[PDB]
Amino acid sequence: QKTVVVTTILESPYVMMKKNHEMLEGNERYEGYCVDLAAEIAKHCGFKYKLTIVGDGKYGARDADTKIWNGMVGELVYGKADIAIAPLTITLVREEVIDFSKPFMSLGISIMIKKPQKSKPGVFSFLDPLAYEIWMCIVFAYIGVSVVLFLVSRFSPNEFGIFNSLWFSLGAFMQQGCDISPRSLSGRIVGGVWWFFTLIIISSYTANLAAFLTVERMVSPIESAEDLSKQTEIAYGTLDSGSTKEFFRRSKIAVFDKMWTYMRSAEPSVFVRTTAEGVARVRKSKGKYAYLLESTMNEYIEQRKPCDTMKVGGNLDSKGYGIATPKGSSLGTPVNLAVLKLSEQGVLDKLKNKWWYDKGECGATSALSLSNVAGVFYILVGGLGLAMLVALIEFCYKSRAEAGRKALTLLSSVFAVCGLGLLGIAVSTDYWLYLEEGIILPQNQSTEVKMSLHSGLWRVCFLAGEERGRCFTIEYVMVNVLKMIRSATPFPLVSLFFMFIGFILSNIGHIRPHRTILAFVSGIFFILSGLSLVVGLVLYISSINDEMLNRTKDAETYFNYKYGWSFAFAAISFLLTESAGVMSVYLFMKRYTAE
Amino acid sequence: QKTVVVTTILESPYVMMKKNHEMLEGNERYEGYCVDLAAEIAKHCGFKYKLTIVGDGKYGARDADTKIWNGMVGELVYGKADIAIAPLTITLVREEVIDFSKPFMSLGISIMIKKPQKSKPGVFSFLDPLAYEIWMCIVFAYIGVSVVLFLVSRFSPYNEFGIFNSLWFSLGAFMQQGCDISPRSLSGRIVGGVWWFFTLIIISSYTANLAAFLTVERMVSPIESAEDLSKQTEIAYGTLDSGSTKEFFRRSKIAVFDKMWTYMRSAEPSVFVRTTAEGVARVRKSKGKYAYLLESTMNEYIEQRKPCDTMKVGGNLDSKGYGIATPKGSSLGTPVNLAVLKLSEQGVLDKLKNKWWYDKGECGAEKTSALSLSNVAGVFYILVGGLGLAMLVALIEFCYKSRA
Amino acid sequence: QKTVVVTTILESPYVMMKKNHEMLEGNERYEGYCVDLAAEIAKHCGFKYKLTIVGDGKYGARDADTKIWNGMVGELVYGKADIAIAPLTITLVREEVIDFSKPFMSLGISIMIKKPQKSKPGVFSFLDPLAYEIWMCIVFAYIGVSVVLFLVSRFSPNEFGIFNSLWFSLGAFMQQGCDISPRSLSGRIVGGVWWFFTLIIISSYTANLAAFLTVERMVSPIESAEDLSKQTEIAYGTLDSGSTKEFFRRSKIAVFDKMWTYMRSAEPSVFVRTTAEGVARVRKSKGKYAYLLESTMNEYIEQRKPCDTMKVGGNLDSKGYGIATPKGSSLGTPVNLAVLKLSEQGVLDKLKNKWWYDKGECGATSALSLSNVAGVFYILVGGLGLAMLVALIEFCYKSRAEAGRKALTLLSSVFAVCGLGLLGIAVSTDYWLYLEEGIILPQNQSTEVKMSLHSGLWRVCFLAGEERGRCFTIEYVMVNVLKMIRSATPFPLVSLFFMFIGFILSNIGHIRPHRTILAFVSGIFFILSGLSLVVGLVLYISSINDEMLNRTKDAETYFNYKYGWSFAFAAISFLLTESAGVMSVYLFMKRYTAE
Amino acid sequence: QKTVVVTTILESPYVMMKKNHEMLEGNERYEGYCVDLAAEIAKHCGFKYKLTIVGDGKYGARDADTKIWNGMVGELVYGKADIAIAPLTITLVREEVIDFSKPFMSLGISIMIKKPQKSKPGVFSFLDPLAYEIWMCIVFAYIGVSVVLFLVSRFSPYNEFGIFNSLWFSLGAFMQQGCDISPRSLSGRIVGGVWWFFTLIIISSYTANLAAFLTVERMVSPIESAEDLSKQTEIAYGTLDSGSTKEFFRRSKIAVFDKMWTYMRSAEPSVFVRTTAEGVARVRKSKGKYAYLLESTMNEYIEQRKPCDTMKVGGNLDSKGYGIATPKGSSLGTPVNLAVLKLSEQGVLDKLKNKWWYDKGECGAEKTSALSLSNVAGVFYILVGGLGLAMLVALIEFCYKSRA
Ligand code: NA
C-alpha cells in the first residue's frame, strides 16, 4: 500500500510545530490535536500516513472570478492531497464538491469578554455616600456647636466648658445620649437644632449607602447575547472576511437582527481583521468590548497565557469540523466509521481535554466584607492610640497639681491676629477654587487640559487657553460664569465686621487688664465671625454644586475641580478664631469672678 | 427609456449628500429617506431616474407680483421636472396646480422642549420624602403630646413638666435618643411610650423613602401637552416668523390655540425664531424655559441627534401630510398613487422611517451619584439659624436677669 | 340639479340616530360627525344632498368566491349611491376601483388599557414590612424582658419593678435612652441582649420598608407597545375579522414580530370578536388585559360613560379616512378641494373636538402621604387617650392614701390556675393552625376549597377532601407533612414541667403563709414556663414559614393559613403566667421583708 | 409520484398528535419539529410523503439472538420505510446498516436539577448582611475598648470602670442609645467618641445591605457543572437504567466521569430511574437533593413546561447528534444530505428549534414579600437565651450572697 498524504494547517492547537523541529523529519515534526487524531484514524482504517502542510495558507473557498479553489479544499479536489484531518468547517459549498465525515468537534459562535476584574475597595471607602465637602463641614459643625455651648451656659446660668461641650458634640453626633443637659432657654435651642442636624445626616448617609449597594446588585454581568442585545456600553466585534460576519447578515432571528443592526451602524470600526487584534481589543478596552470568536478558539485562548479573557453564554449557532475525503475514494466510508467509533469510546473527548485544558496554563458573596468597612476600624484603633497618649497628659497635669493667666492672654491674642490674618490673606490672595475641564480624545486617554482657573473672590483670573494674562475683573464681563462672588460676598464681609470688633476689644482688655466687660463682648463677636465663616463656606460650595449639576452631562467632555490654598486658609481661620473664642470668654471668667 | 427627472431638496434625512460627493455619480452621491423612496417608486412603476436637487432652493409658493411658481413646484409646472419625490406638504394652493399622492408620511405641529435632566436641589429639599401634610401633622402632634404631658404631670401629684419641660421632652424624643427628664406616672409610662413609637415609624419611613428616592431616578417633564403649556406662563412659547406654523395659530378658532396666539402677539423678548436651527439652539441654551414649536418630523429627528438635548412632548396639534407630487397631467400620476399605498400596506414606509430616524441615529434607545452639599443644604441653615436664635434670646435673657 | 345620495353607516359618533327620530324625515333625522361634514362639503361643492344608510351593514370588501363588493364600497361602484362621506379607510384594494379624497382624519392602531386605578393605603399600612407574626412576638418580648428585670433586680441587689421595667421595655424598644440602669452582672445581660433585639428589628423594618418603596417605584406603567413587548402579565387582544389583525401578520418590524408571536400562541383566545366585547374584556380584567383599537375609537370610548378605559402610547401605524367619489364623476375634484379647504381653516379640527370631546361626558407625588403612615397617628392619639384615663387612676389611688395582701394572693392564685388551664386546654383541644389550599378556576375567581385542616399538636386531623373522619395519628403516617409536633414538642412539654412546679409551691405558700422561700421558688419556675412559651411559639411559626417557603410558588394554586383558638389560648396563657410571675415574686417581698 | 413512506416516533416536540386526531387525515393530524422538518426536506428535494408512526415503538437496536433490527431502523433496512425523519441518534452500530445525514440538531448529556426557588431561613440568618469576619472583629474590638476604658480609668485618678462596668458601657454603646456610666477623662472623651463612631457606620452598613438584600432577589444554583457536582455528596446523581446514558459513564476513562460512575455503582437508595418521566417527578419531589442526567433536548423542553420546576445547569458532557436517516442505498441519500445543511445555513433549523422549544411553550422568558418570623427567628432565641442565662447566674449569685 502507498502513503496517504494528510494536509493539515498551522493553526494552534490543531497542528503546530514541535519545539525540537529543524532536528527531525517528515511527520514526526508536528504535534497537536490533528496529529494525535491522524495517529488514531490510521490504526482503525489501515493507513500509513505522511503529513504535509496546506499550500497557500487557507482552508478552502471559491474565487468568484476564476472559480478555482484555494487551500485544503483546493488541494484535495485537484488530484493532489488525500485525507484531510483538519479544522475544516462543514458548510454547503464545500460538501457539494468534497465528502465530509461526521463531525469530530461541535463548535459555534460564542462571546469573548475580559475577566470580571475585581475592583478592591479603598481604606476610606465607608465615606463614599457623603462626599468630602460634607464630612469637613461636619467637623466645622460640632466644633462650632461646642463653642456656642461653651458660651451660652457660662454666659449666665454652668457645666458646659469646651471639655464638656465637645462631649455634647462627640456625644450627640454619634447618636449616643449625652449625660448632662443644658438648663436655660437659649441652652436648649443649641441642643435642640443640633439634634436635628444629626438626624438628617445619618438618615442621608444610610439612605445613600443603600443607593450604592442596591444599584451594584441591580447591574448584571453578560451571560448571553440576549443580555448583550439590550446593552450599548459594551460594543461588539467580529472578524471581517469570514463566516462570523456571514452569520449575522442572513440571520432572521430577532435577536441577531438587532445585533447586526448595531454592528452595521456604529463608530469606530468594530469589524476587526486578524483575530490576534480582536483578542487584543478585548484586553486593553476593559469592560467595554466583546469580540465574537468560534467556540473552539476562545476556549483555547481562555486556557492560555495570562488568563485575561473568558467565554460567556452559549453557542449562538451550531456547526462542526470534519475529516474531508476527496470525492468518491475508498477512504470515505472507513474514515466515516473511524470517527464514530472514536466519538463513542471517548477518544475525541479525551484529545480535546488533553490539548485545550491539560496542556493549557491556567486554573480550573452578597455581603459586605472587612475591606468595605475598613477605615472605621482604623479610626477606632487610631482613636484609642490617641487616647493612651492623653492618659499621659492628665496624669502629668495632676502631678503638677501635686507639686497661667499670662499664657491664657498669650493664646487668645496670637490666635486672634492669625485669624485676622489668614481670613484677610485668603480673601486677598486669589488662590481659591481650581476649575478644570476639557473633552476626550479616545484610544489614548487624553490630557486635553485647555482651560483652567485659579480664581479667588475678587481677582478672578485665567491661565491657559489663549493664556489671557489680562483676564477679567468685577467690572462687567462680556459660556462659563462664576457664582462664587455673586452670592457669597457678604458672608465673609460680615465676618470681617464681627472680627474687626474682636481683636480691638481684645486689645482694650489687654492694655488695661482691670477692664472686664470689654473682653466679654470681645469674645461674643469672635464666634459670630466664625459662624459667618460656616454659612460662608457652605453657601460657597452649594453654589458650586449647583453649577456642577448644570453640566448637562456630555459623556465625552471631562471635568475636574480642586480647592486651593486660600480655601484652606479660611478653613484654618475658622479654627484660629473659634479656639480663641473659647479662650477669650474663659479669660473673662478667670478675671471677673476673681474680682 | 425616458430618464425621469426627479426633483428633491437638501434636508436631512430626506436627501443627504454622502461623503463621496466629489468622487461619485449623481444617483450614487445622495442618501436619505427620499433616496430610498425614489428607488421603491421606480421599482414598482418602472422608469429611470436622476436626482435633480432644486436650482432655486425653496419648496414652492406663488409670488403675487409676477405669478410665477418657484422651487420644486416651479420645476414641475413649467416643465423642468417630471416627479417631485420630496417632503412637499399637501396644501390647497399647491393642489390647484399639481397632483399629490395619498400621503407617505403623516406629520403635525408638535412641541419641542429640553430634556428633563437632573435638577437643582432646594434649600428645603430634604423635606421631599415625607410630604407637606406629614411634617405639619408631626408638629401639631408635637404640641399634642406637649399639652398632654403638662396636664398629666400637673394634675397627678395631688411639677418638673411645665411649659419649659413638656415642650422639651417631646423634642428630645422625636429628634432621637431621649432626654433625662423621664416621666413618672403610669400615664407618663404611656405618654413616653406612644410618642416614642411615633418616633420609630416616621424616621423609618423617612429613611426608606429617601432610599427609594435615590435608587430609581424617575424624572418627569414639566409640560406634556399644549393644554398644560397653555395654562402656564413660566416656559416661553416659540414659532418660526414666516411660515405655515405661524399662520396656523393666527386663523385658528378653537380658542385653545387662540390663547397661544395672544401670548405670542405681545411676547417681548422676541420669541419668534428666524431660520429654525437657531431655535434649536435657543431651546438648548435657555435652560428649559423656552419651548419651540416644530413639525413632528424635525422633532423626531433632532431628538435623535448629538448632543442629545431635546425631546418632543404631547400629541400632534394638527395633521398635515407629505406627498410625492406629479405635474398637472401626466402618465406617472396614477401608478405612483397606487405605489405609495402599496409600500405603506407592506410596511416599507414604516421601515424606512424606522431606519433613518431611529436606527441610523444617536441617543441609543444608574450612575450612583453621591450626595452633594446642596442636597442637605438647609439643614445647615436650620442649624446656624438655631444657633443664631439662641444668642438673641440669651441677650434677651441677660437683659431681664440683671434688671430683676 | 339633482339630489346627490350620501351613503354613511350607523357608527357612533360618525352617524347615529337623533333622539327625536320617528318624528322627523329624511336627512334631518341623523346627527354626528359625518352629518356636520356633509353640511360643510355641500356648501363648498354645490350639492343638495340627501343621506341614506348603507344597505347590508358593511364598509366594503371583496367576497373571494364571487368577486362582488359589499356595503358602502359595494353601493357606489354598482351604479347606485353617489358621494360617500363616511369612515372609509384608505386601503389599496379600495382605491383601485373607487376614488378617495385626501384624508379628513388620521387614525392608527392604538392601545387601550384600564385606568391606573389608585389603590388607597390601609389604616394600619405601616406594619406591612414586618408581618403580624413578628409584631405579636415583640409584644411577648418586652412584656417578658420586663418580668425578668422585675425578677433579677429585686431578686438581690432595686429600682426595677414591673412599673419601672416595662419603662425599660417601652424605653429601649423605641430606641430612646432609659433613665435608670441595672447594677448586677445578671442585670446587665438582660439589658445587654435586649438592646441587641431592638437593633435588628428596627434594621429589619427600615430595610424592608425600603424594599417596598423601591420596587414600587421600579415598576412602570404602559406607555408604548415597546413596553408591552417585554411584559407578559398584561395580555394583548385584537378583533378577529379585520385590519387590526391583518397589520400584525405581514408586519416586519421587530417589535410587531414579537407582538404577533405572543398573540398567535397563547391561551385562552385573545382574538376577540365584536369590539364591545373587547372593551368589556378591558374593564373586568383589572390591569391584566390590553385591547388594540383604531385610534378614533378608543379616544371616543375614553370620553364616554364611566371613564374606565384610557389610551396610552402612540399610533403604531398610520392610515386615514376619506370621502369616496365613485370612479370618474365630476364630484371628485371639487370634493378633493373641499376637504383640503376645510382642513386648513380648522373646521375638520373643530368638528372632532365637538363630537369626541365636547359632547363627551368625562373630564379633561413621589412622596409618602398621610394615608401611608396613618395608624401611628391613631396609636399616638389612642395612646394619649389612654393616658388621660390613667391620670384619673393615680389621682384616686393617692386620694385613698390620703384617706391588700389577700388580694395579692387572690391575683396570683387565680391567674396561675387559669395559666395551668389555658395551656393544658390548648395543647389538648385540637384547634391550632388552620391550613387551607386549592387551585384556581379562572373567569369566576373560584372557591376550590377541597382541602383543609384543624390540626392541634397530637390529634392532627382533616375535614374535607374525601372528608376522612378517621384522619391520622402520631402512629406512623404512610404530599403534605406537619413539622409542628416534629420539632416543637418539648418546648411546651418543658413549659408544663416548670408550670407544675409553679402552682404546687404557690399552694404550699398559701396553706401556711409563714413559709417564705417556697413562694420565692414558686415564682422562679413560673417565668421559666413562660419563657418556654416564647421559644415554643417562635419555633412553632418558624417551622411553618419554612413550610411556607417550600411551596415552589405554583401561580394558579392558592393557599391560606389562619391561627386557631388554641393558638390564642396559649398566647393568653403567656399573659396569665407572666403576670402572675410578677405577683408571686412581689408577694415574697411583702412577706419576707416584713419578717 | 412515488409516495415516500416517512417514519417517525411519537415524542414531544418532534411529532405530537394534534387534537383533531380523530377527525383529520394522516399528514394533517401530526404536529411538531419533525413535522415541520419533513415539510422542508420534501420542499427542497421534491417528493410526496405520508407519516408512518412506527409499528413496534422503539428507535432501533440489534437483537443478538435472531439478528433482526427493530423499530425505525427495522423499517428502513428490511423495506417498510423510505426515509426516517426522526430523532435517531447517530451511532456506530446504526451507521453500518443505514446512512444518516450530517446532524440537524446537536445534543449532549446534560444535568437536570430543580429550580433554585426561595429557600428556608436559618436560626442565625440575620447575620447574612455583615459577613462572619466583621461580626468577630466587632467582638474583638468590643473587648478592645473594654481593656482601654479600664486601663484609662484605673491609671488616671492618681474607679467606676472595672471589669463590671467597662465591659458594660461598650455594650451599652454599640447596642445603641448609650448608658449612664459616662466616662470622665479627656481620654474618656475619645474612648466614648471613637467607639461611638464605630456604632454608626456598622449599623448603617447593616441596614443598607439588608435593604439591598431584600430588594434585588438574586438567587443562585447549588451546582453549575459536573465538576461541582463531582466534589459534592449532598445532591444525588441519577441516570436511566438501560440506555446510552448509563453506558456512557461506564466505559468513560477521563477520570471525572469515572468518579461519577463510582457513586452510582454503590448508590443504595436506588438512584437509577426506570422510564424517564418518573425521574422528572423524582427531581420535582426530592427537594433539590436529586439531579437527573438527561439528553440536552429533553432538558431544554421540560424546562419549558408547566409546572415550571426544573432547569438545566452546566455545559454538555458529551456531544452526539441527530440525523435524517436513509436506507443503505437509495436515491434520497445525497439530496437530503445537502438539504439538511442548506436549511441550517439559512437558519431554518435554528428557527424551528426556537419555535417549538422556546416560542410554543410555557414559563415565559418583585412580589414584595413581607418578612416572616423565621427570618428574624434567632433573635428571639438570643433574647430568651439571654433571659434564661440571667436566672442561672442569679441563682449562682444568691448562693454565695447568703453564704457569705
Ligand atoms: Na437607622
A534 Cβ under 8 Å from any chain B Cβ: yes
Residue C74 CA to ligand 1 center (angstroms) comes to: 75
| DSSP result, D33-77 | HHHHHHHHHHHHTT--EEE---SS-S-----TTT----HHHHHHH
Distance D140 CA to ligand 1 centre (A): 24
Which parts of A86-131 fold into alpha helices (H)? Answer: 92-95
Does C89 appear as a known binding residue? yes
Segment holding A560, helix H or strand E: strand A558-562
D94 among annotated binding-site residues: yes
Report strand pairing: D109-114 vs D310-313. antiparallel
The answer to whether residue C159 neighbours chain D at the CB level (below 8 Å) is: no
Over its C-alpha atoms, chain D yields an Rg (Å, rounded) of 34
Task: Check: CB of residue A144 under 8 Å from CB of residue A112.
Answer: no
In the numeric block, the cell 449647583 is attached to A546
Strand residues in A360-411 grouped as ranges (E): none
- Which chain B residues are within 8 Å of C365, Cβ to Cβ? 131
Q: Is A337 on the interface with D (CB under 8 A)?
A: yes
Please choose, from the candidates C132, C127, C169, C129, the residue with its C-alpha nearest in 3D space to the C-alpha of residue C147. Answer: C169
Nearest residue, CB atoms, B354 vs list C214, C253, C346: C253
- How much distance in Å is there from the Cα of D206 to the middle of ligand 1? 9
The closest alpha carbon to D290, from D222, D210, D379, belongs to: D222
Do residues B128 and B376 make contact, with C-beta atoms less than 8 angstroms apart? no
The answer to whether the annotation marks A40 as part of a ligand binding site is no
Look at D254 and A346 and tell me if their CB atoms are within 8 Å: yes
Closest residue, chain D, to A126 (C-alpha): D201
User: With contacts defined as CB-CB under 8 Å, which chain C residues touch D371?
Assistant: 129-131, 134, 204, 208
Max intra-chain CA distance, chain C: 129
Closest by Cα among C462, C456, C459 to C475? C459
Peptide bond into B13 cis (omega under 30): yes
From the list B178, B207, B208, the residue facing D177 with the nearest CB is B178
Q: Report the alpha-carbon angle C232-C238-C239, nearest 5.
A: 160
Measured in angstroms, the CA of C268 and the nearest CA of chain D are apart by 13
**HEC string for chain B:** CCCEEECCCCCCCCCEECCCCCCCCHHHHEECHHHHHHHHHHHHCCCCEEECCCCCCCCCCCCCCCCCCCHHHHHHHHCCCCEEEEEEECCHHHHCCEECCCCCCEECEEEEEECCCCCCCCCCHHHCCECHHHHHHHHHHHHHHHHHHHHHHHHCCCCCCCHHHHHHHHHHHHCCCCCCCCCCCHHHHHHHHHHHHHHHHHHHHHHHHHHHHHHCCCCCCCCCCHHHHHHCCCCECCCECCCHHHHHHHHCCCCCHHHHHHHHHHCCCCCCECCCHHHHHHHHHCCCCECEEEEHHHHHHHCCCCCCCEEEECCCCCCEEEEEEEECCCCCHHHHHHHHHHHHHHCHHHHHHHHHHHHCCCCCCCCCCCECCCCCCHHHHHHHHHHHHHHHHHHHHHHHHHHC
Which residue of chain C has the CA closest to A178? C177
Cα distances (Å, whole numbers) of residue A578 to A23, A427, A583, C242, C556: 86, 19, 9, 83, 70
- In A, which residues are within 8 Å of B180 by CB distance? 177, 181
> Which candidate in B204, B207, B210, B216 is best for mutational testing of the D interface (most D CBs within 10 A)?
B207
Is C128 close to D370, i.e. CB distance below 8 A? yes
Residue of B nearest to D215 (CA): B212
**Which chain B residues touch D178 with a CB distance below 8 Å?**
177
> For chain C, what's the residue count?
595
Which residues of chain B lie closer than 8 angstroms to D207, CB-CB? 207
C-alpha separations of D141 from A381, D149, D167 in Å:
9, 12, 11
CA dist., res. C567 & res. C492, Å (int) = 12
Any chain A CB within 8 A of the CB of B181? yes
Give the Cβ contact number of residue A483 at 10 Å: 14
Gap from C177 CA to chain A (nearest CA, Å): 7
* C258 to A257: CB separation less than 8 angstroms, yes or no: no
Other C-beta atoms closer than 10 Å to the C-beta of A151 total: 25
For the record, the C-alpha cell of C356 comes out as 369626541
| C552 is annotated as contributing to ligand binding | no
Domain that holds residue A33: 4-114
How close A428 comes to chain C (CA, Å)? 46
CB-nearest partner of D200 from A175, A212, A340: A175
CA–CA separation, B170 and B173 (whole Å): 5
Q: How close D276 gets to chain A, by Cα (Å)?
A: 22
Separation between Cα atoms, residue A434 and residue A455, nearest integer Å: 7
Determine the residue type at A271: F
Which one, of A111, A100, A52, A110, lies nearest residue A80 by Cα? A52
Give the distance from CA D5 to its chain's centroid.
42
Q: Compute the nearest-CA separation of B211 from chain D (Å).
A: 9
Size of interface A-B (CB pairs under 8 A): 172
Length of chain A: 595
Cell (9 digits) for C574: 403567656
The strand pairing partners of C99, in sequence order, are: C325
ω into A13 cis (within 30 of 0): yes
Q: Do A166 and D189 touch (CB under 8 A)?
A: yes
User: CB neighbours (10 Å) of residue C120?
Assistant: 6
Span from the CA of D199 to the centroid of ligand 1 (angstroms): 11
Three-state SS annotation for C148-213:
HHHHHHHCCCCCCCHHHHHHHHHHHHCCCCCCCCCCCHHHHHHHHHHHHHHHHHHHHHHHHHHHHH
- Angstrom distances, CA of residue C267 to CA of A532, C257, D362: 71, 19, 10
Q: Give kind and range of the element (H or E) at residue A423.
A: helix A405-428
Chains that touch B (3 or more CB pairs under 8 A): A, C, D
Contact C380 B128 (CB under 8 A): no
Is the CB of B266 inside 8 Å of chain D's CB atoms?
no
- What separation in Å is there between the alpha carbon of A196 and the centre of ligand 1? 15
Distances, alpha carbon A332 to alpha carbons A82, A452, C590, in Å: 10, 75, 108
Task: Answer whether D370 sits within 8 Å of C208, measured CB to CB.
Answer: yes
Asked if A549 is an interface residue toward chain B (Cβ–Cβ < 8 A), one would say: yes
Distant-in-sequence, close-in-space partners of C226: CB < 8 Å, separation ≥ 6: C255
Q: Is C183 annotated as a binding residue?
A: no
Question: Residue C531: which residues within 8 A CB-CB, separation 6 or more?
Answer: C144, D384, D387, D388
Among all residues of chain B, which has the CA nearest to that of A187? B390
Q: Does C212 touch chain B (CB under 8 A)?
A: yes
> Which residue of chain D comes nearest to C231, CA vs CA?
D364
Breaks (C–N over 2.5 Å) after residues, chain A: 157, 364, 403, 478
Distance CA C394, CA A547 (A): 62
Method used to determine the 3D structure: cryo-EM
What's the grid cell of residue C24?
322627523
Q: Does A214 touch chain C (CB under 8 A)?
A: yes
Number of Cβ atoms within 10 Å of the Cβ of A127: 16
Is the CB of D177 less than 8 angstroms away from the CB of C176? yes
CATH of the domain at B50: 3.40.190.10
